[PDB]
Scaffold this active site. Sequence first.
Site, PDB file in Angstrom:
ATOM      1  N   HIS A  20       0.807  -1.218   0.000  1.00 22.81           N
ATOM      2  CA  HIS A  20       0.000   0.000   0.000  1.00 22.81           C
ATOM      3  C   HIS A  20       0.836   1.262   0.000  1.00 22.81           C
ATOM      4  CE1 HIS A  20      -3.983   1.873   0.666  1.00 22.81           C
ATOM      5  NE2 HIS A  20      -3.319   2.792   1.344  1.00 22.81           N
ATOM      6  N   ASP A  22       0.359   5.363  -1.227  1.00 25.61           N
ATOM      7  CA  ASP A  22      -0.658   6.365  -1.590  1.00 25.61           C
ATOM      8  C   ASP A  22      -0.149   7.494  -2.496  1.00 25.61           C
ATOM      9  OD1 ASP A  22      -3.424   5.864  -0.582  1.00 25.61           O
ATOM     10  OD2 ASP A  22      -2.382   5.695   1.356  1.00 25.61           O
ATOM     11  N   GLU A 123      -9.105   1.418  -1.874  1.00 25.87           N
ATOM     12  CA  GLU A 123      -9.093   1.518  -0.424  1.00 25.87           C
ATOM     13  C   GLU A 123     -10.433   1.981   0.132  1.00 25.87           C
ATOM     14  OE1 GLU A 123      -5.983   3.944   1.395  1.00 25.87           O
ATOM     15  OE2 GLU A 123      -6.186   2.797   3.258  1.00 25.87           O
ATOM     16  N   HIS A 150     -12.847   2.150   4.586  1.00 20.12           N
ATOM     17  CA  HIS A 150     -11.777   3.027   5.023  1.00 20.12           C
ATOM     18  C   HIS A 150     -12.031   3.353   6.505  1.00 20.12           C
ATOM     19  CE1 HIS A 150      -9.218   6.779   5.143  1.00 20.12           C
ATOM     20  NE2 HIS A 150      -8.368   5.811   4.846  1.00 20.12           N
ATOM     21  N   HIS A 191      -8.063  -1.568   7.919  1.00 15.02           N
ATOM     22  CA  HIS A 191      -9.141  -0.618   8.260  1.00 15.02           C
ATOM     23  C   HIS A 191     -10.427  -1.162   8.860  1.00 15.02           C
ATOM     24  CE1 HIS A 191      -7.484   3.282   7.005  1.00 15.02           C
ATOM     25  NE2 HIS A 191      -6.823   2.587   6.096  1.00 15.02           N
ATOM     26  N   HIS A 212      -2.055  -3.029   4.818  1.00 17.91           N
ATOM     27  CA  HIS A 212      -1.255  -2.178   5.699  1.00 17.91           C
ATOM     28  C   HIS A 212      -1.828  -2.188   7.123  1.00 17.91           C
ATOM     29  CE1 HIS A 212      -4.271   0.459   3.899  1.00 17.91           C
ATOM     30  NE2 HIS A 212      -3.941   1.502   4.642  1.00 17.91           N
ATOM     31  N   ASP A 320       2.645   2.105   3.656  1.00 16.31           N
ATOM     32  CA  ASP A 320       1.776   3.282   3.697  1.00 16.31           C
ATOM     33  C   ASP A 320       2.507   4.558   3.282  1.00 16.31           C
ATOM     34  OD1 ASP A 320      -0.920   4.114   4.064  1.00 16.31           O
ATOM     35  OD2 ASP A 320      -0.252   5.301   5.793  1.00 16.31           O
TER      36      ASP A 320
HETATM   37  C1  LIG Z   1      -6.245  10.717   3.423  1.00 14.56           C
HETATM   38  C2  LIG Z   1      -5.286   9.622   2.975  1.00 14.56           C
HETATM   39  C3  LIG Z   1      -3.858  10.177   2.922  1.00 14.56           C
HETATM   40  C4  LIG Z   1      -5.397   8.418   3.900  1.00 14.56           C
HETATM   41  C5  LIG Z   1      -4.534   7.235   3.441  1.00 14.56           C
HETATM   42  N1  LIG Z   1      -5.108   6.608   2.227  1.00 14.56           N
HETATM   43  P1  LIG Z   1      -4.341   5.882   4.654  1.00 14.56           P
HETATM   44  O1  LIG Z   1      -3.577   4.797   3.957  1.00 14.56           O
HETATM   45  O2  LIG Z   1      -5.729   5.296   5.113  1.00 14.56           O
HETATM   46  C6  LIG Z   1      -3.345   6.464   6.040  1.00 14.56           C
HETATM   47  C7  LIG Z   1      -3.792   6.043   7.466  1.00 14.56           C
HETATM   48  C8  LIG Z   1      -2.712   6.477   8.481  1.00 14.56           C
HETATM   49  C9  LIG Z   1      -4.274   4.580   7.621  1.00 14.56           C
HETATM   50  O3  LIG Z   1      -3.943   3.680   6.821  1.00 14.56           O
HETATM   51  O4  LIG Z   1      -4.996   4.372   8.593  1.00 14.56           O
HETATM   52 ZN   LIG Z   2      -4.083   4.662   1.905  1.00 13.24          ZN
HETATM   53 ZN   LIG Z   3      -5.188   3.140   5.017  1.00 12.00          ZN
END
Ligand SMILES: CC(C)C[C@H](N)P(=O)(O)C[C@H](C)C(=O)O
Ligand SMILES: [Zn+2]
Ligand SMILES: [Zn+2]
Length: 393
Positions: A20, A22, A123, A150, A191, A212, A320
Amino acid sequence: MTSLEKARELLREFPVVDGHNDLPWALREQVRYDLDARDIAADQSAHLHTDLARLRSGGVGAQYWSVYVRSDLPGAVTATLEQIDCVRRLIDRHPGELRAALTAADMEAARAEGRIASLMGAEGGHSIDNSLATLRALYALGVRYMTLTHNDNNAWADSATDEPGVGGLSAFGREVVREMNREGMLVDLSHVAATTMRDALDTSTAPVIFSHSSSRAVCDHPRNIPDDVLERLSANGGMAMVTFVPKFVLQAAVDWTAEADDNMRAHGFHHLDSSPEAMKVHAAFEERVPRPVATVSTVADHLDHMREVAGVDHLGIGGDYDGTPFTPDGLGDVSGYPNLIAELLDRGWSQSDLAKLTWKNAVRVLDAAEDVSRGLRAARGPSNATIEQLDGT
Ligand SMILES: CC(C)C[C@H](N)P(=O)(O)C[C@H](C)C(=O)O
Ligand SMILES: [Zn+2]
Ligand SMILES: [Zn+2]
């Protein structure tokens, strides 16, 4: 040679498949996909965790590029298509360094020719707008995993960072998992709530992943994986891809973030408030309580425990990068992986253990998804079910 030198040698043979990254979201937000303004064929250290030279230095041989979009804004499907287009444009712009990969065989083909296999992972289930045909369209466009939620619940699955909703997966949620199984899209349980993890493991006929997530036993945070879920991976055949996010992996960082959030609320702000006034309050907190810093050792602590509980065949890495502003020391950007591999060597991890962690487990898992999909595609047609039919009005 040093452990770091050995780590680089090992990664040249069996590079990292990272679960993962971004970069696409970072490009969307920083420059609205003006790729010339963040050319990854040049040094982007000032702005991004990721560019081509650092990926190579880091020993990354395959990347699941995240096509994350916000669940709290309208037009998630359109935004997801824009994220997918970003990944496609990056691949087209850098044919010397990147190769599109849709299959496990494509990953090996990329490795044989020294190009970074470039896959896509969605995601959050909001990217399909409660539509199984939309799920199938994302697969057709190259998406090879989908994180079921998410940070917020969706209509059919519960997030770890929201209140209980449907209690894990709803009936339609199980239908989504079945359809992912039939298409060959990996079910990603990063998540999601622990209830959702268990429901997904009950339902899935294919190996699942955590693209992740780290260990809840090592650091108690809902974004991490409970031992009872890790224990189920060997039977399921899936894998947990450890993440580097400090506020998930370092106890002191979890505690600090909780105290920071409490402090925000003490001043009448929602903990996610980003107004100048809220920022002033947070700045004052960090002034009197400096932000703790994780290290490579922190991440290795998670991998040691995950290895003990899940087994070495059920582990990967999902940094990440470009999804989090903060990183552990030694893992400050995508060039950092050899530092983690060196630490693991120092802890007695074998060369074959490490080749599984970096490369072989991820290829096995995607191949398994393809295998399960072959059987299901031959056995039945695609589902035409709706959320109204399965979950009610
Ligand atoms: C808004 C964007 C940058 C969120 C990211 N896609 P994320 O990968 O969900 C980062 C986060 C710390 C987690 O994984 O919980
Ligand atoms: Zn992400
Ligand atoms: Zn994430």
